[PDB]
Design a protein around this motif. Structure first.
Motif, short mmCIF file in Angstrom:
data_model
loop_
_atom_site.label_atom_id
_atom_site.label_comp_id
_atom_site.label_asym_id
_atom_site.label_seq_id
_atom_site.Cartn_x
_atom_site.Cartn_y
_atom_site.Cartn_z
N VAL E 52 0.83 -1.20 0.00
CA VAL E 52 0.00 0.00 0.00
C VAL E 52 0.87 1.25 0.00
O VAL E 52 0.55 2.24 -0.66
CB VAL E 52 -0.97 -0.02 1.19
CG1 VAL E 52 -1.75 1.28 1.27
CG2 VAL E 52 -1.92 -1.20 1.07
N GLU E 55 2.23 1.82 -3.55
CA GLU E 55 1.19 2.37 -4.42
C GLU E 55 0.89 3.82 -4.08
O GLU E 55 0.71 4.66 -4.97
CB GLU E 55 -0.07 1.51 -4.34
CG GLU E 55 -1.11 1.85 -5.39
CD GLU E 55 -0.61 1.61 -6.81
OE1 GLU E 55 0.24 0.71 -7.00
OE2 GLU E 55 -1.06 2.32 -7.73
N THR E 56 0.84 4.14 -2.78
CA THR E 56 0.58 5.51 -2.35
C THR E 56 1.71 6.44 -2.78
O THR E 56 1.46 7.58 -3.16
CB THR E 56 0.39 5.55 -0.84
OG1 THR E 56 -0.64 4.63 -0.46
CG2 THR E 56 0.02 6.95 -0.38
N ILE E 59 1.22 7.17 -6.42
CA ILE E 59 0.11 8.10 -6.60
C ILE E 59 0.52 9.51 -6.20
O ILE E 59 0.16 10.48 -6.88
CB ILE E 59 -1.12 7.61 -5.82
CG1 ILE E 59 -1.67 6.33 -6.44
CG2 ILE E 59 -2.20 8.69 -5.79
CD1 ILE E 59 -2.95 5.84 -5.81
N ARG E 60 1.26 9.65 -5.11
CA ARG E 60 1.70 10.97 -4.66
C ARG E 60 2.69 11.58 -5.65
O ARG E 60 2.68 12.80 -5.87
CB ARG E 60 2.31 10.88 -3.27
CG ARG E 60 1.30 10.62 -2.17
CD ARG E 60 1.97 10.45 -0.81
NE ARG E 60 0.99 10.17 0.24
CZ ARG E 60 1.31 9.92 1.50
NH1 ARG E 60 2.57 9.90 1.91
NH2 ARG E 60 0.34 9.69 2.38
N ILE E 63 0.58 12.90 -8.37
CA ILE E 63 -0.10 14.11 -7.90
C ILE E 63 0.84 15.30 -7.95
O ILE E 63 0.46 16.39 -8.39
CB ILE E 63 -0.65 13.89 -6.48
CG1 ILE E 63 -1.81 12.89 -6.49
CG2 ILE E 63 -1.09 15.21 -5.87
CD1 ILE E 63 -2.38 12.61 -5.11
N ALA E 73 -2.43 23.32 -3.37
CA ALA E 73 -3.37 22.31 -2.92
C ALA E 73 -4.71 22.52 -3.61
O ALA E 73 -5.33 23.58 -3.42
CB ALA E 73 -3.54 22.35 -1.40
N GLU E 77 -11.93 17.59 -4.76
CA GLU E 77 -11.54 16.25 -4.36
C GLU E 77 -10.61 15.63 -5.41
O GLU E 77 -10.33 16.22 -6.46
CB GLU E 77 -12.78 15.38 -4.16
CG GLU E 77 -13.55 15.66 -2.89
CD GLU E 77 -12.98 14.94 -1.68
OE1 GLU E 77 -11.94 14.25 -1.83
OE2 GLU E 77 -13.57 15.05 -0.59
N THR E 78 -10.14 14.43 -5.12
CA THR E 78 -9.19 13.72 -5.98
C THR E 78 -9.66 12.29 -6.19
O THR E 78 -10.11 11.63 -5.25
CB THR E 78 -7.79 13.73 -5.37
OG1 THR E 78 -7.37 15.08 -5.14
CG2 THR E 78 -6.79 13.05 -6.30
N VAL E 80 -8.34 8.66 -8.30
CA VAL E 80 -7.26 7.97 -9.00
C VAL E 80 -7.88 7.00 -10.00
O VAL E 80 -8.66 6.12 -9.61
CB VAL E 80 -6.32 7.25 -8.03
CG1 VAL E 80 -5.19 6.57 -8.79
CG2 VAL E 80 -5.78 8.22 -7.00
N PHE E 107 -7.24 -2.87 -4.36
CA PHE E 107 -7.67 -1.47 -4.51
C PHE E 107 -9.02 -1.45 -5.22
O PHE E 107 -9.15 -1.12 -6.40
CB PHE E 107 -6.61 -0.68 -5.28
CG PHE E 107 -6.77 0.82 -5.17
CD1 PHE E 107 -7.84 1.38 -4.50
CD2 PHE E 107 -5.84 1.66 -5.75
CE1 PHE E 107 -7.98 2.75 -4.41
CE2 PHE E 107 -5.97 3.03 -5.66
CZ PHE E 107 -7.04 3.58 -4.99
#
Ligand SMILES: [K+]
Ligand SMILES: [K+]
Ligand SMILES: [K+]
Ligand SMILES: [K+]
Ligand SMILES: [Mg+2]
Ligand SMILES: [Mg+2]
Ligand SMILES: [Mg+2]
Ligand SMILES: [Mg+2]
Ligand SMILES: [Mg+2]
Ligand SMILES: [Mg+2]
Ligand SMILES: [Mg+2]
Ligand SMILES: [Mg+2]
Ligand SMILES: [Mg+2]
Ligand SMILES: [Mg+2]
Ligand SMILES: [Mg+2]
Ligand SMILES: [Mg+2]
Ligand SMILES: [Mg+2]
Ligand SMILES: [Mg+2]
Ligand SMILES: [Mg+2]
Ligand SMILES: [Mg+2]
Ligand SMILES: [Mg+2]
Ligand SMILES: [Mg+2]
Ligand SMILES: [Mg+2]
Ligand SMILES: [Mg+2]
Ligand SMILES: [Mg+2]
Ligand SMILES: [Zn+2]
Lengths: 219, 115, 305, 59, 110, 154
Positions: E52, E55-56, E59-60, E63, E73, E77-78, E80, E107
């Motif tokens: 996890v 994967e995070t 994703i970050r 982003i 910021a 909302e976001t 994926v 996921f």
RNA sequence: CUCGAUGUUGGAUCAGGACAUCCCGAUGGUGCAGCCGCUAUUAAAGGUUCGUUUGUUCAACGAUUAAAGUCCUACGUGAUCUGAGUUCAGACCGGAGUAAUCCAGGUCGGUUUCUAUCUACUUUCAAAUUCCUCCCUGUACGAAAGGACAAGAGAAAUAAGGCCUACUUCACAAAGCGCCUUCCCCCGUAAAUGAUAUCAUCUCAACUUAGUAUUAUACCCACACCCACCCAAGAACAGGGUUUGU
């Protein structure tokens, strides 16, 4: 809608049943003795029974400088200058010795504590023992007096200029110097006002207390 | 409240008290086993270079509820026989002294204000 | 061999179901024991000189001021009786002592967090488990059948009692706090010695006497206060207003018994014996007893004369 | 019948049994009569203990 | 204060091998039903947590590539989205983070 | 004698503790999932919940704006807090954060836990889940429940 | 016995013990009318103050108390503290010596180390001592002056054990300056009957009584739920709750 300060429990680990029973006793005493509404600054005359006294009845008039204590045993301190000698007496609200409490003048000050009147000039603590009761019109806001007193030359009983006391009714600009003010502005804790976890709600507790008071009024 | 080396204020209209002197009245003995003097207690004062007895009629220390608290350590000069030196006490004194009036009747008689 | 707890293998549906079942069972068991005199009561002997009855296990709610008719203020402690029942009786011969003993239980606790032996002991008696069990020495004529509930009416105003409890533990403490030693001066050259014991013994013996006061654990032991007056009894919430303070913190279980002081001796003739039975009582007691000299809240303002 | 033992002479009043609890001021001496009243099986037990050999088999 | 005499090996062994100083056996070790690796009952599985976290982190990184600067910021909302996925009605008005891989089975697209 | 001391002693002082909690809270508001030592990640959970409460109170509230300005070191997160974080939990009355213990840190072997805001866009963490209702004990308890319901409804 | 090191005067903290007892307790005598005293026997459970100058131990003085006891404990106790004194190296005054230097002389200043290996100990769990006030009583006693004891009631101080309702230091709590409780004795003698010794005799004669506590009683007492969380429980450990395990 005024709730007396002693009707708010202090945060802790006490069973609410004890608070409920203490409030029941407080209301059963209030029905006999009408405790009025007053704040820190209001002028009060308290008449109490007392052995070894002229007529067994003693009356004291003074300004309320401190209210402290929760439940039965809550106390308020009245200060008055008599014959040039300052006298402060601590009266319990629910003491059966108390025969009558009268609000000669109902008002509020800029601070929740007036203990600095000990170090202030006697003119700000001198009150007439026999003054006519003022008239407060119904459905009116409690007046907020903004009398910034003048203090006696230092030293004082407590360091009133430090932010921990946070006094807004003292002529610091007159009784202190710039260097003294800067030095006092060293114990300041800006994070204290923003520490969220150091806050007490009192909302739900006050609502429940009002409901119980209404029930007592009904019965 | 009032102990040894405590500078007290004499409130009666005595000749020994209420007089100019370079030093101030000071307690040197409290006549109590615990060593702490309260309202209604006899103490020994070194006033004007002399030793005299006094009765405590007020102290700044907070006490029991429903009792006055004065802003100065007020005392009244008395003698060994129990008679005061002065003849007038304008400063108010607590009504609690009327329980001790059995031995302070003259002091309470010369007193005028009872708070 | 793996550690297990009651809700480890339970699912989301079965988690509240077991709690509801055990709560309902505990409530039913508590309600079923409200008629000791209607469920095979033991003989009720009259009070006799030199007789001792059973005590109570109470919860220290807090403290409250009170005023008497002589213009005096006394602080009292509120002790609440919660699920107090008689659990076990032991005869004089089997007591291995001098007098017969009776077991009294206190606050109700969860059955999950207890031992198997305790649970199977309480199953026979048909009562929820009690947090604390105390032993009271009673005479033969004061025998009470196990399962009988107890209430604050067991004690009446005008009676002096003894309260035993564990005090507020303060942990490892120094000599000055533990025993009140004066310590050493904080100035005038003292070097790393301000709160130290000092000399512990003399040089001739070459050892330390047993019982010498030294830093150690402090504050967590059983202490008993003797001779506390019962100012007021509240029979609605089962609360005793006991004169003065009692050992222990708030919300703690304490043992309340008749005073053993010689001055307060043989003063149980007017007290209920062996205990108070509300079911057998026909004239229900008032909500508050208020003793004699206690200034009741509804009483008029006191006027000394 | 350890309660009915007999002492020759005035041993009931002269003979003293002494002990120490270990604490300061904990030295206690009692007479034979007092010890017998407190524990009727103490005198014979102490005599046998004193007469037995001073080794680990005495217990 | 100096020692008076050397301590013997017998006393040293008695002190060192006391059961208090010995390591206790942990009985809270279990088997993760998903990855099959050992885990404690009160602690998350290390294998799944690392998966996890990887994967995070990806994703970050995506982003941050979309943001392209500090103190940025988004106010919305976001969501994926992976390969072969189209924006949904819920995803409408939300910043879309595109991942160049198939959506993992664990996921779940809630 | 620390009885009733809800707040523990961390950092170089009270202000240092406040600043550390503020940095952790800012990181949590930004990334919506951060791992930290168990005590440090547990101390500021209530602060995060109260920050969400202030966000619910709204940006038009001067006290809420002051609190957000204080507790958010990066000023780009204040619009986020007042615009997306609060409406996300508008329905909920509490419990906006999940804290779960993780394996200890490699170097210092410190007790570590991960905290996250609910409803984040990040991949879900593994969660402690109870046994299925189809197990033997659960089926037995379900049968007992059915029998008891039948007895009650009878 | 120790110079291959056994650190001292006085003080702070902690006290252990002896009685040859200062007070409180119980008795005999008196040149004991009472009140004060003097002396002798027994009793060591409890207690025996604060300041001025002096480094002081002591003495002098001022004010109290029932009392401000005598000694031993490595002139108790510096791996708990102090360094004012004594007792190094600097310097001054008086004296001795030609000088260097010296003084039971005086005076100012002058580094007080140690992380505990071993023995011992770390809640001897809970019966308390005294002063004062009223009454007795202006009584007994006494020419008067003067002036009790016993019994009862009350209020205080000290000591021990707890607590935070009110005040205060302060505020989820810890504390005192605040509040609550605190229960047995202690043996010297004084006296009946009564022999040896047909009186008498309190008896290391047999015997009765003041005259005694098996120090009474109280407290503690159930225990493979314990992975995990919380705690008024706690250094770790241990303990209590989880029917408060999103
Ligand atoms: K030597
Ligand atoms: K040597
Ligand atoms: K050794
Ligand atoms: K003879
Ligand atoms: Mg001050
Ligand atoms: Mg002179
Ligand atoms: Mg504690
Ligand atoms: Mg000190
Ligand atoms: Mg040094
Ligand atoms: Mg220092
Ligand atoms: Mg640190
Ligand atoms: Mg050597
Ligand atoms: Mg001693
Ligand atoms: Mg003697
Ligand atoms: Mg010596
Ligand atoms: Mg040293
Ligand atoms: Mg030494
Ligand atoms: Mg020197
Ligand atoms: Mg010369
Ligand atoms: Mg010198
Ligand atoms: Mg110098
Ligand atoms: Mg050391
Ligand atoms: Mg008398
Ligand atoms: Mg005869
Ligand atoms: Mg004859
Ligand atoms: Zn896994």
């Amino acid at each position: 809608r005024f709730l007396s300060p002693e009707f708010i429990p202090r945060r802790g680990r006490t069973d609410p049943l004890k608070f409920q029973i203490e409030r029941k006793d407080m209301l059963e005493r209030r029905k006999v003795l009408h405790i009025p509404e007053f704040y820190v600054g209001s002028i009060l005359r308290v008449t109490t029974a007392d052995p070894y006294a002229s007529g067994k009845i003693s009356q004291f008039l003074g300004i309320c400088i401190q209210r402290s204590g929760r439940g039965l045993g809550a106390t308020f301190i009245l200060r008055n200058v008599i014959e040039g000698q300052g006298v402060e007496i601590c009266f319990e609200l629910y003491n059966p010795r108390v025969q009558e409490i009268q609000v000669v003048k109902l008002e509020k000050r800029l601070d929740d504590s007036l203990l600095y009147l000990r170090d202030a000039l006697p003119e700000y603590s001198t009150f007439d023992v026999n003054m006519k009761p003022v008239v407060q019109e119904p459905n009116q806001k409690v007046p907020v007096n903004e009398l910034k007193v003048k203090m006696k030359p230092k030293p004082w009983s407590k360091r009133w200029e430090r932010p921990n006391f946070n006094i807004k009714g003292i002529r610091f600009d007159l009784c202190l110097t710039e260097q003294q003010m800067k030095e006092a502005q060293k114990w300041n804790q800006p994070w204290l006002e923003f520490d969220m976890m150091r806050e007490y709600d009192t909302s739900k507790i006050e609502a429940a207390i009002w409901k119980e008071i209404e029930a007592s009024k009904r019965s | 409240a009032i102990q040894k080396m405590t500078r007290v204020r004499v409130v009666d209209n005595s000749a020994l008290g209420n007089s100019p002197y370079h030093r101030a009245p000071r307690c040197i003995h409290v006549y109590k086993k615990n060593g702490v003097g309260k309202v209604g207690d006899q103490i020994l004062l070194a006033i004007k270079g002399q030793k005299k007895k006094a009765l405590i009629v007020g102290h700044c220390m907070p006490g029991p509820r429903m009792t006055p608290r004065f802003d100065s350590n007020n005392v009244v000069l008395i003698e060994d026989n129990g008679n005061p030196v002065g003849t007038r006490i304008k400063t108010p004194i607590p009504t609690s002294l009327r329980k001790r009036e059995g031995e302070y009747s003259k002091v309470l008689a010369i007193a005028q204000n009872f708070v | 061999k793996s550690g297990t707890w009651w809700d480890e293998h339970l699912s989301e549906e079965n988690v509240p179901f077991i709690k509801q079942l055990v709560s309902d069972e505990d409530k039913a068991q508590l309600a079923s024991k409200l008629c000791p005199l209607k469920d095979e009561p033991w003989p009720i002997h009259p009070w006799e000189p030199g007789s001792f009855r059973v005590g109570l296990i109470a919860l220290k709610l807090g403290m409250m001021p009170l005023w008497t008719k002589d213009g005096q203020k006394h602080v009292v402690t509120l002790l609440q009786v919660q699920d107090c029942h008689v659990l076990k009786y032991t005869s004089k011969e089997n007591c291995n002592g001098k007098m017969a003993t009776l077991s009294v239980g206190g606050k109700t606790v969860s059955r999950f967090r207890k031992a198997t032996s305790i649970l199977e002991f309480y199953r026979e008696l048909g009562l929820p488990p009690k947090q604390t069990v105390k032993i009271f020495n009673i005479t033969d004529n004061a025998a009470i059948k196990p399962g009988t509930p107890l209430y604050a009416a067991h004690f009446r105003p005008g009676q002096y009692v003894d309260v035993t409890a564990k005090t507020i533990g303060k942990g490892f403490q120094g000599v000055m706090k533990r025993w009140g030693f004066k310590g050493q001066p904080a100035t005038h050259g003292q070097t790393k010695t301000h709160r130290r014991p000092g000399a512990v013994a003399t040089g001739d013996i070459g050892r330390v006497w047993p019982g010498t006061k030294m830093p150690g654990k402090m504050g967590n032991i059983y202490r008993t206060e003797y001779g506390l007056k019962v100012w007021r009894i509240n029979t609605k919430h089962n609360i005793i207003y006991v004169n003065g303070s009692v050992p222990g913190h708030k919300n703690c279980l304490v043992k309340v018994k008749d005073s053993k002081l010689p001055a307060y001796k043989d003063l149980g003739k007017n007290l209920p014996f062996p205990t108070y039975f509300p079911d057998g009582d026909e004239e229900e007691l008032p909500e508050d007893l208020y003793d004699e000299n206690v200034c009741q809240p509804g009483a008029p303002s006191i006027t000394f004369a | 019948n350890t309660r009915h033992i007999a002492f020759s002479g005035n041993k009931w009043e002269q003979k003293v049994y002494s002990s120490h609890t270990g604490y300061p001021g904990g030295f206690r001496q009692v007479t034979a009569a007092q010890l017998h009243l407190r524990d009727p099986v103490a005198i014979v037990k102490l005599a046998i203990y004193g007469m037995l050999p001073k080794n680990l088999h005495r217990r | 204060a100096a020692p008076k005499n050397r301590r013997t090996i017998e006393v040293n062994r008695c002190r060192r091998r006391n059961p208090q100083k010995l390591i206790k056996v942990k009985n809270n070790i279990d088997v993760c039903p998903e990855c099959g690796h050992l885990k404690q009952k009160h602690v998350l599985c290390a294998y799944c947590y690392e998966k996890v976290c990887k994967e995070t982190a990806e994703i970050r990184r995506q982003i941050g590539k979309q943001e392209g600067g500090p103190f940025k910021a988004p106010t919305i909302e976001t969501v994926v989205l992976y390969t072969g996925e189209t924006p949904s009605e819920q995803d409408q008005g939300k910043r879309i983070i595109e991942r160049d891989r198939k959506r993992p089975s664990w996921f779940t697209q809630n | 004698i620390s009885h009733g001391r809800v707040f523990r002693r961390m950092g170089l002082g009270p202000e240092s503790r406040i600043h550390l909690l503020r940095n952790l809270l800012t990181g949590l508001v930004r990334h919506e999932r951060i791992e930290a030592p168990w005590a440090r990640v547990d101390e500021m959970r209530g602060y995060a919940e109260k920050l969400i409460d202030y966000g619910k109170l709204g940006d038009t509230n001067e006290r809420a704006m002051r609190m957000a300005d204080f507790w958010l070191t990066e000023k780009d997160l204040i619009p986020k807090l007042f615009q997306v974080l609060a409406p996300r939990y508008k329905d909920q009355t509490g419990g906006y954060t999940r804290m779960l213990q993780i394996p200890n840190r490699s170097l210092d072997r410190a007790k570590m836990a991960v905290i996250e805001y609910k409803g984040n866009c990040l991949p879900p963490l593994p969660l402690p889940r109870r046994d299925s209702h189809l197990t033997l004990l659960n089926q037995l308890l379900q049968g007992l429940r059915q029998d008891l319901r039948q007895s009650q409804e009878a």
